[PDB]
Amino acid sequence: PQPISRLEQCGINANDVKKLEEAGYHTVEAVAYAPKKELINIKGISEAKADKILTEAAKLVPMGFTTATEFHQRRSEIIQITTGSKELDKLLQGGIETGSITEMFGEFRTGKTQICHTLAVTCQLPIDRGGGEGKAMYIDTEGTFRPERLLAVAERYGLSGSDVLDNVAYARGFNTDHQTQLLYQAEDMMVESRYALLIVDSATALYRTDYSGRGELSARQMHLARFLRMLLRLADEFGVAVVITNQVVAQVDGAAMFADPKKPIGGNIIAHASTTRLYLRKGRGETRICKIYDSPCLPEAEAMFAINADGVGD
Amino acid sequence: PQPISRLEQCGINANDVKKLEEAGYHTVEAVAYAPKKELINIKGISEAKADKILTEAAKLVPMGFTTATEFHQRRSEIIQITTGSKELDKLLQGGIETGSITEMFGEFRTGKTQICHTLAVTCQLPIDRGGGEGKAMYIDTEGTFRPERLLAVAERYGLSGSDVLDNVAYARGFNTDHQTQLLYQAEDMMVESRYALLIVDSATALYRTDYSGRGELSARQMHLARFLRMLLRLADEFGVAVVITNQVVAQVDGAAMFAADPKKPIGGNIIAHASTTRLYLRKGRGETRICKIYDSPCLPEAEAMFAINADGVGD
Amino acid sequence: PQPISRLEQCGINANDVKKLEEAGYHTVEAVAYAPKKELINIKGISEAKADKILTEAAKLVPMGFTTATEFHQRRSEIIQITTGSKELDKLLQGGIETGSITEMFGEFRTGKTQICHTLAVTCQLPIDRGGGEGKAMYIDTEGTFRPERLLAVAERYGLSGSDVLDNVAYARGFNTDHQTQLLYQAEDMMVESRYALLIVDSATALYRTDYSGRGELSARQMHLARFLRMLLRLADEFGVAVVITNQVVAQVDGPKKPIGGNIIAHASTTRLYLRKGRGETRICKIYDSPCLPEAEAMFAINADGVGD
DNA sequence: TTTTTTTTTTCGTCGCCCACGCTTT
DNA sequence: GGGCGACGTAGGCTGACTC
DNA sequence: GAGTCAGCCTATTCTTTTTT
Numbered sequence A: 001p002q003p004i005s006r007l008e009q010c011g012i013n014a015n016d017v018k019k020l021e022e023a024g025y026h027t028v029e030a031v032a033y034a035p036k037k038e039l040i041n042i043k044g045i046s047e048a049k050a051d052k053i054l055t056e057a058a059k060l061v062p063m064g065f066t067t068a069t070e071f072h073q074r075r076s077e078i079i080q081i082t083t084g085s086k087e088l089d090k091l092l093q094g095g096i097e098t099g100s101i102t103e104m105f106g107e108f109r110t111g112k113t114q115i116c117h118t119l120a121v122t123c124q125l126p127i128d129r130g131g132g133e134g135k136a137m138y139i140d141t142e143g144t145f146r147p148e149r150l151l152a153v154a155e156r157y158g159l160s161g162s163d164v165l166d167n168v169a170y171a172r173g174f175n176t177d178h179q180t181q182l183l184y185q186a187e188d189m190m191v192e193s194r195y196a197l198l199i200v201d202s203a204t205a206l207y208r209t210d211y212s213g214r215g216e217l218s219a220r221q222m223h224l225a226r227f228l229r230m231l232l233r234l235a236d237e238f239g240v241a242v243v244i245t246n247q248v249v250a251q252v253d254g255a256a257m258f259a260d261p262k263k264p265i266g267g268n269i270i271a272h273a274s275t276t277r278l279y280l281r282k283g284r285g286e287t288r289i290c291k292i293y294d295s296p297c298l299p300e301a302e303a304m305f306a307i308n309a310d311g312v313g314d
Numbered sequence B: 001p002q003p004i005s006r007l008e009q010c011g012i013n014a015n016d017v018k019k020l021e022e023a024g025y026h027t028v029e030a031v032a033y034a035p036k037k038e039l040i041n042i043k044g045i046s047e048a049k050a051d052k053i054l055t056e057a058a059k060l061v062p063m064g065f066t067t068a069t070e071f072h073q074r075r076s077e078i079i080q081i082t083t084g085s086k087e088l089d090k091l092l093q094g095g096i097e098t099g100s101i102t103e104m105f106g107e108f109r110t111g112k113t114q115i116c117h118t119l120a121v122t123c124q125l126p127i128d129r130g131g132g133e134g135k136a137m138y139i140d141t142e143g144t145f146r147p148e149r150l151l152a153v154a155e156r157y158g159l160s161g162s163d164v165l166d167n168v169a170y171a172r173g174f175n176t177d178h179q180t181q182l183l184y185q186a187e188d189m190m191v192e193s194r195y196a197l198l199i200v201d202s203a204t205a206l207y208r209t210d211y212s213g214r215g216e217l218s219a220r221q222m223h224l225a226r227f228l229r230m231l232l233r234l235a236d237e238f239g240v241a242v243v244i245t246n247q248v249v250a251q252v253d254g255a256a257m258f259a260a261d262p263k264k265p266i267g268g269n270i271i272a273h274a275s276t277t278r279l280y281l282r283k284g285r286g287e288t289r290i291c292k293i294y295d296s297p298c299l300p301e302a303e304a305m306f307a308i309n310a311d312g313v314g315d
Numbered sequence C: 001p002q003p004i005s006r007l008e009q010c011g012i013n014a015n016d017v018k019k020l021e022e023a024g025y026h027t028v029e030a031v032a033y034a035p036k037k038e039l040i041n042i043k044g045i046s047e048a049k050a051d052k053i054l055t056e057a058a059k060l061v062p063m064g065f066t067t068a069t070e071f072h073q074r075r076s077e078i079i080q081i082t083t084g085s086k087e088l089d090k091l092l093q094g095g096i097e098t099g100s101i102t103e104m105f106g107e108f109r110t111g112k113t114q115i116c117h118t119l120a121v122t123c124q125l126p127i128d129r130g131g132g133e134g135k136a137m138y139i140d141t142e143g144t145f146r147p148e149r150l151l152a153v154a155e156r157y158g159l160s161g162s163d164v165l166d167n168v169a170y171a172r173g174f175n176t177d178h179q180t181q182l183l184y185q186a187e188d189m190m191v192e193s194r195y196a197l198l199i200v201d202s203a204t205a206l207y208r209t210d211y212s213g214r215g216e217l218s219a220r221q222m223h224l225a226r227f228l229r230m231l232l233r234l235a236d237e238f239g240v241a242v243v244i245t246n247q248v249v250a251q252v253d254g255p256k257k258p259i260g261g262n263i264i265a266h267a268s269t270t271r272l273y274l275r276k277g278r279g280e281t282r283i284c285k286i287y288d289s290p291c292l293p294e295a296e297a298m299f300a301i302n303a304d305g306v307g308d
Numbered sequence D: 001t002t003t004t005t006t007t008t009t010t011c012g013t014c015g016c017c018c019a020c021g022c023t024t025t
Numbered sequence E: 001g002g003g004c005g006a007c008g009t010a011g012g013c014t015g016a017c018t019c
Numbered sequence F: 001g002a003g004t005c006a007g008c009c010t011a012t013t014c015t016t017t018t019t020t
């Protein structure tokens, strides 16, 4: 919420920060969250330019030791976008939370993109009846973004039309390097607007196909880590929920389970860098089962939703 | 689709274009959908050259953020090919869609190569009766391409008969590889003439046999993923409909099932997420099959019914 | 039908061409119909030795796109061996075509080997009478190959005798492994003389007996999906007319299902179904076929093979 | 003239089988 | 009705025999 | 009395469920 126009001051001109702009940084909270090395590789930045930039960015960002009675009253006003369902909102104690990565893995025909389609329409509702009012972002990397399914949920939620269809930025990631450069552009839109969501559908779809052979595994999880850290600097900067959708693999070995293995794709890189992880599952007919699979404050309980003609629901 | 020669400017000499055309990059929308680490693995191309290519290609291909209103206006002009059956059409809301991979699994004699023979005569129809006004590629992998069915679906409708059999490219895949190489030779054929179909008679047929499992399960699924990736590049670059046919493996146990040989598609979880829509051809009575939408991001899970008939899939 | 000796060129020494003959590959076609990954596993070929094999092979045998009107004038030269009948020759549109597998399941006594004893005599008739032109090759596996039935089918079409019995190669399977190494010695005699049929009777017979239990249902169906693949190779190069004989199990759900499962049901163009009727008259219903409608007919096993 | 640091990372499902058993004036 | 077992368990070396 | 020829740990022990 602070563009770099309040940092082009105090012994710093705007020409040097003009380099920061094309370096990726568009916020005062984006250079302060960045280390010395990352901003020292930029052509132009002298070590002094670097230490001055950091010390003057520290001025406008709280970087210190707060108490836990001041962090409790900052998360008592956190916005929680509601999913379409009520049995899925009770399980999550309020819908997807803002300022945290929320993975949704599952296998197929489970509802990983129908939740991401009823979330891009509820995150446009007043906070008093749903999500936090603001636009959304759909970074679709599978080809499945149906705008005809947004007008179905925005016929039950009372939202009208092309208004819903308009406050949804949509981008299509074609490879694994254009996925990560589609965020240096998203951080340019989120500061000249008010977004309240960032859906990255199948965030790990273009990793299964780009890096393959076990000789490209340390080079894949060193890119996934960068991705999920760049996606964690968008959730702390502007406070936007970051639902990321994942996939599953099948460990073909000793059962040691007695049973069908799912074990979502992405190792201990997308597992240790994710706040909540919902495990969607197939059920009888149109009913699905969503089990919380990891969360710092939520019980490991189960729920029940259904993919209606209006997105997920009851 | 603009050829690679279209980007030949800005200090990109013709040798670069030529050495990019030998790696399977024949379109300017095939070098902008390619990661840099894959343009680096090409002889001659260095880091600076790769960056130059990837910068001068993103100026010729739209790569950015667009609202969901200029995507709901480029999606209302999606030509949907008729499948030959009204019931099948209603279930699929109009017919196979352009720009997507549409899988069709099911046990033997269900109809998966007859909805692949009535589909390649319908894509050559005018758009007023359902079609694409183009040609129909047919990369068959099992040897069951019979052009005497394209000469009956061409009499049910009204086409000539000698002009429907001329607008059908045919190629037989003989290995797990080669099958992909046909998709690399397919970019050449599709840049020049207008194609509107990419039928693959059995994608996961040569994967079995060529791979023995467990030992090569991992290897087979990184070769299948690199096949369903070309199938998506060709679809999102040429705007064609990549129909595709799958086989079936019976869950011998563990599935903990009960009914008759519950059957699941082969291919694992890498043909399950890659495919946009999945249709399940089942069999009923004498000449009456069943079709249930397994997976689809827009279509409700329904259940239609069709008949192989003598003039191709109908009702 | 090009001996692999033709590949002996461009850095292809007799060391390499020899190396190919003891792995199975005997025709240059069989090498272009072969994955890259399979070449390295053969000893002596490491990285670019294998690649160079395929590069010159791909120029000899053509593998690429072609119009579907120059495939019609390839499907109009199919030999279509007659199965010594007329009611079974109108059900099929001219008997067993060449270049495609054809399973014939049924039950005991139906006549799956009495049609394999008529397609070993009517595959040597002149192409005018309705047969092919060459030599049958019976690969029997159950032990039922009585050569007094392919001599009483020869005293019906005017064929002399011993000569009809001189063009029918024979081999017993013995094991599930011996019957797939018999397809590698068949590719050695198809490249010299002209063969027009591979009866391979009693397939999937030593699979229900050698590989037994749900424990082997995996290695049975990747040793049967490879047998049915080597069988599709000899049907593509030499244009032979591979016939296959299945058996059945009894569905105990609540009922004659052929053995093999979804492995033998998928890798098959046409698929007949013999069934016993009254007296010596059976029923042949086309289970599966990619072009031919699904109907049924009536044949009869009289004293000279399949008759009417 | 010299004087050795420093680990990283998971990925991939497959293959159907086997018939039984008379009983009722 | 009731049935399960399958890498990529390598490699260096203890059991064990083999001369 | 070392040569092949071998059969297994250097490390343990989670999933977690559908499908008719």
Ligand SMILES: Nc1ncnc2c1ncn2[C@@H]1O[C@H](COP(=O)(O)OP(=O)(O)NP(=O)(O)O)[C@@H](O)[C@H]1O
Binding pocket: B106, B107, B108, B109, B110, B111, B112, B113, B114, B115, B144, B308, B309, B310, C265, C266, C267, C268, C269, C287, C288, C289, C290, C291, C292, C293, C294
């Ligand atoms: N000309 C025809 N007239 C009527 N029915 C036909 C005709 N040709 C084929 N059929 C029927 O269509 C059925 C389906 O054949 P096909 O479409 O090849 O099945 P499939 O599922 O593709 N088989 P496979 O590829 O071996 O798994 C056949 O089994 C026949 O019953």
Ligand SMILES: Nc1ncnc2c1ncn2[C@@H]1O[C@H](COP(=O)(O)OP(=O)(O)NP(=O)(O)O)[C@@H](O)[C@H]1O
Binding pocket: A106, A107, A108, A109, A110, A111, A112, A113, A114, A115, A142, A144, A307, A308, A309, B272, B273, B274, B275, B276, B294, B295, B296, B297, B298, B299, B300, B301
């Ligand atoms: N309009 C609709 N009405 C009812 N049900 C629908 C509708 N659209 C989709 N569905 C159902 O919801 C599912 C949507 O697909 P979804 O489960 O979101 O894809 P996914 O799990 O991401 N699969 P993939 O991306 O291929 O791994 C379908 O399989 C249908 O069962």
Ligand SMILES: Nc1ncnc2c1ncn2[C@@H]1O[C@H](COP(=O)(O)OP(=O)(O)NP(=O)(O)O)[C@@H](O)[C@H]1O
Binding pocket: C106, C107, C108, C109, C110, C111, C112, C113, C114, C115, C142, C144, C280, C301, C302, C303, C304
């Ligand atoms: N010379 C003959 N004259 C008349 N009928 C004959 C003659 N030879 C055989 N048959 C009949 O043909 C039947 C079928 O034999 P065959 O073709 O071996 O059956 P099958 O079902 O293939 N046997 P199997 O392989 O054990 O399942 C015999 O059982 C006899 O009834």
Ligand SMILES: [Mg+2]
Binding pocket: A112, A113, A114, A116, A117, A144, A145, A146, B297
């Ligand atoms: Mg979706």
Ligand SMILES: [Mg+2]
Binding pocket: B112, B113, B142, B144, C290
């Ligand atoms: Mg077929």
Ligand SMILES: [Mg+2]
Binding pocket: C112, C113, C142, C144, C202
């Ligand atoms: Mg027999």
